[PDB]
């Protein structure tokens, strides 16, 4: 019974390995070897956002590519204009132990969460003129690590109880539970069509979930340690992960394989955040060595370095128009690069 | 503002008021003492909270000094992913029960509970996030130890112990083991107190330890220590 099922599971892992190997006719490095390189990517700090008095843990761009939201351990969630550096809102939190925040694509709401196991959703557009709590979503039994809005008045959250959840905000109840991880779920990323999403966890694995069905479509492995960050490739057919073993990896959803590894010999610090440029040719990654690296996504070369932060870089984002990159770190400053 | 419109100027004034409020809330926040509560199962943490799910935060005032005590014992997730959030706390209050020397864990009947307590203690002392964070060690339930020590020698948990099976020697032996688990002697200070469920001086002891920690921190900051 139990032995029979375990033996059948082993044969399935063997066939999946064989099915993947049979499709590895050539590597990506053997196809992109003749592409003209991106050269050297020079970027300079254009804006510095001051006002957080503690470590900054999360940051999210608005879909207008102008408004920012950032969360810090001083209990503050600040919304920034970032063109004039003016502060638009400063929301005090009922629990200062915030680790994640998100900005609604409509611009009407923001969400946050952390060690209180509750995802709080705030209404930014009220008649009283102030920002008030609209919902408190409870039901996770671990810390909330990442949350992202969908356009259907729904939100996807991940927590330290190894599960993911799809919540209906208006009702305040879970509509879907995604189970299958064997460790803390650290990162989520939504597909451009908001129909699939990927989650990366502390069991050195990432999973592709169907947000409408609740079932896991496929599982990707290859990292040697916990995955801290995950992001989709712009066309939705690939994604990249960052882990504690100082390596980035590019995975293909249709080939069901790892394509490229991004690492170097002098980098021994973990990766906290990863993002792609608008065209997907540049991969940006934040490290614990206080710097950020720009990699050639197709040639796996280091195209540039972003430096100027005095502590660990904890969050990174790129605007929808591709015009700028925002970084945040434990020195309580946000920086915008071009 | 010579290149701004009226609405841009008003937005800048709004930003300045937000700044002014943030600075005030920062100044109020910096005067509160942040204490992190760590203990093993059935270590008397409930009594320590009483005398002074997610995270639980307890607030109190003693001698016009505000304390904020954080209990993280309800979490069941990898500590290394969220323990760094508590870098910068004034002190870590660590609770160890003295009646656990001859008890074993329910999960593993062969694992002594007090050795797991020492494993947690030396995982917390020699971390990289708490290199300069002092530890206030409460050895609880001393009134339940002096009566049972006569029947259960320390050799059940400490086979290398030589001496008398009395409270006076055993308490000092356990205190020495816990204090010797530390390696950063010159930077980290452990304050050990022997208390019980009927004790009332725990608040004053915490106050004194926190006062000494703040004095040492200020001396180090002002370049005098």
């Amino acid at each position, epitope marked *: 019974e139990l032995d029979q099922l375990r033996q059948e599971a082993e044969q399935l892992k063997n066939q999946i390995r064989d099915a993947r190997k049979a499709c590895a006719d050539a590597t990506l490095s053997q196809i992109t070897n003749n592409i003209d390189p991106v050269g050297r990517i020079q970027m300079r700090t254009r804006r510095t956002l001051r006002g957080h008095l503690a470590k900054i843990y999360a940051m999210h761009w608005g879909t207008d590519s102008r408004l920012l939201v950032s969360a810090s351990q001083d209990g503050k969630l600040i919304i920034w204009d970032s063109y004039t550096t003016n502060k638009v809102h400063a929301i005090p939190l009922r629990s200062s132990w915030v680790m994640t925040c998100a900005y609604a694509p409509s611009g009407n709401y923001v969400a946050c969460g952390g060690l209180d196991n509750i995802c709080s959703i705030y209404n930014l557009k009220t008649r*009283e003129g102030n920002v008030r709590v609209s919902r408190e979503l409870a039901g996770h039994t671990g810390y909330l690590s990442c949350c992202r809005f969908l356009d259907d008045n729904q939100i996807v959250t991940s927590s330290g109880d190894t599960t993911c959840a799809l919540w209906d905000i208006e009702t305040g109840q879970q509509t879907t539970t995604f189970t299958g991880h064997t460790g803390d779920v650290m990162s989520l990323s939504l597909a451009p069509d908001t129909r699939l999403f990927v989650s990366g966890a502390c069991d050195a694995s990432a999973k592709l979930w169907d947000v409408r069905e609740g079932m896991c479509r496929q599982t990707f492995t290859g990292h040697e340690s916990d995955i801290n960050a995950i992001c989709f490739f712009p066309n939705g057919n690939a994604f990249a992960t960052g882990s504690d073993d100082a390596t980035c990896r590019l995975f293909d959803l249709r080939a069901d394989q790892e394509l490229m590894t991004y690492s170097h010999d002098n980098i021994i610090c973990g990766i906290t955040s990863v993002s792609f440029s608008k065209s997907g040719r540049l991969l940006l990654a934040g490290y614990d060595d206080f710097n950020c690296n720009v990699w050639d996504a197709l040639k796996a070369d280091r195209a540039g370095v972003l430096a100027g932060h005095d502590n660990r870089v904890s969050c990174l984002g790129v605007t929808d128009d591709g015009m700028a990159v925002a970084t945040g770190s434990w020195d309580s400053f946000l920086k915008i690069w071009n | 503002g010579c290149t701004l419109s009226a609405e841009d100027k008003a937005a800048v004034e709004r930003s300045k*008021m937000i700044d002014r409020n943030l600075r005030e809330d920062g100044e109020k926040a910096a005067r509160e003492v942040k204490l992190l509560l760590l203990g093993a199962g059935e270590s008397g943490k409930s009594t320590i909270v009483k005398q002074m799910t997610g995270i639980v935060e307890t607030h109190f005032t003693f001698k016009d000094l505000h304390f904020k005590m954080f209990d993280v014992g309800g979490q069941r997730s990898e500590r290394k992913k969220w323990i760094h959030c508590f870098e910068g706390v004034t002190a870590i209050i660590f609770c160890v029960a003295l009646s656990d020397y001859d008890l074993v864990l329910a999960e593993d009947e062969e694992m002594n509970r007090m050795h797991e307590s020492m494993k947690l203690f030396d995982s917390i002392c020699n971390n990289k996030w708490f290199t300069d964070t002092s530890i206030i060690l409460f050895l609880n339930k001393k009134d339940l130890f002096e009566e049972k020590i006569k029947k259960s020698p320390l050799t059940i948990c400490y086979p290398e112990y030589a001496g008398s099976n009395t409270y006076e020697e055993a308490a000092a032996y356990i205190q020495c083991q816990f204090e010797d688990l530390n390696k950063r002697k010159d930077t980290k200070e452990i304050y050990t107190h022997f208390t019980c469920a009927t004790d009332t001086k725990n608040v004053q002891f915490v106050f004194d330890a926190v006062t000494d920690v703040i004095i040492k921190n200020n001396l180090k900051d002002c370049g005098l220590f």
Partner: single-chain antibody
Amino acid sequence: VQLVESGGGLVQPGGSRKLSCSASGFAFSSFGMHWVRQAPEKGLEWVAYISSGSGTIYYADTVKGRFTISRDDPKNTLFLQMTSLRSEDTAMYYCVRSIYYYGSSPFDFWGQGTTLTVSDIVMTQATSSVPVTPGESVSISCRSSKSLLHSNGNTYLYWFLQRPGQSPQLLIYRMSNLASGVPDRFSGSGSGTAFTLTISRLEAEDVGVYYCMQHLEYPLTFGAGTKLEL
């Protein structure tokens, strides 16, 4: 969200009078406040502004030296002290709330108005009244003596509607943006010094006087007002 003005009545010429406004249902201290008065000629004149932090205060050049605007946040009260009252100060006085940040609506809610009786960028609306029938579209024009398009890309034009017996209501902010609660039948357009408000279909509740305002620089100036008459 309610604003109640009080303290009006008859005043002898050369006297003094305090008007007050009580706010309820919103964060009064986060809003700046305007006093805007309507003379019996039914034109709107901007009188005074005091910011949310009381650090910025502006007056119209007709009331400088005679009027004083003030706030008391803990009572949510706005005060206007008037001295040396003249026969030209007889008007309906409206209290207006205003909040300024990226994407905000600065003239959304108006008060009800208190009656006081005493014993620059020019906005032109050449058409004083338009004969209208329900179910038809209408176009109202407004022209500025100076371009309202700022180097930051924003054009500071506002469209308001005042129904008979009611306070003015905001319809469009910054030229093309529809105010909350306003049906999508209203649309704003224009460029430079030319502005147009179009209504695809009139209903019974679209009758009244439409005003255009500039908010590029102080003092704030209103148009003459175009009336729609059934």
